[PDB]
Amino acid sequence: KLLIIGTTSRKDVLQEMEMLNAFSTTIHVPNIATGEQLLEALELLGNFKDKERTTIAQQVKGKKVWIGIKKLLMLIEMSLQMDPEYRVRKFLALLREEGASP
Amino acid sequence: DRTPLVSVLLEGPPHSGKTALAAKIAEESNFPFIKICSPDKMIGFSETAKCQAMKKIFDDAYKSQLSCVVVDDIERLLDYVPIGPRFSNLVLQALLVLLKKAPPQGR
Ligand SMILES: [Mg+2]
């Protein structure tokens, strides 16, 4: 027997070369869309907690977001280098400048 | 005997069985010499190597009394890719010449 698993990030181009007949099926890996999923990811990653979490929710529940999961292990670790008073604001600003095309 | 050389082309959509209806005709012919020149035994070759291999497989068919040869998946022998388009010229020329070269007398 055998089994081949290939990973690609640009499906249309591969479809143009007639390389989507060779493969026998296809799976789709999505991104974080709903705010609740982002909150769950933050809860499980072990980061801002207590009132901080609350305020984030207050500003994020009434809107849609679009962010990958390898890009949310950098924003957390890029907004932790400030003083312990503006971390939340910097995280929100970075998400706003990143969460494009909701 | 007016025509010592013949040819045929099997065409259809993809995934339909045009390599198991072309081996069962050759098998049920009971000819002495039968060969299959497929594209999976020459992974990575350049143009000249493919030309030499094709020439050898055809030459070994000129030294019998009556023979059959199968060229399956043509469009992969001469690399094709819709972008461009791109492909190999030497292999196409070798093919276009080898389909009109009558074998020695009486074969
Ligand atoms: Mg085939």
Swiss-Prot record, chain A:
Signal peptide per UniProt: none
Localization (cell): Cytoplasm
Domain of life: Eukaryota
Family stated for the protein in its record: Belongs to the AAA ATPase family.
Function: Required for vesicle-mediated transport. Catalyzes the fusion of transport vesicles within the Golgi cisternae. Is also required for transport from the endoplasmic reticulum to the Golgi stack. Seems to function as a fusion protein required for the delivery of cargo proteins to all compartments of the Golgi stack independent of vesicle origin. Interaction with AMPAR subunit GRIA2 leads to influence GRIA2 membrane cycling.
Assembly with partners or alone: Homohexamer. Interacts with GABARAP and GABARAPL2. Interacts with GRIA2. Interacts with PLK2, leading to disrupt the interaction with GRIA2. Interacts with MUSK; may regulate MUSK endocytosis and activity. Interacts with CDK16.
Name of the protein in its database record: Vesicle-fusing ATPase
Species name: Cricetulus griseus (Chinese hamster)
Biological classification of the source: Eukaryota, Metazoa, Chordata, Craniata, Vertebrata
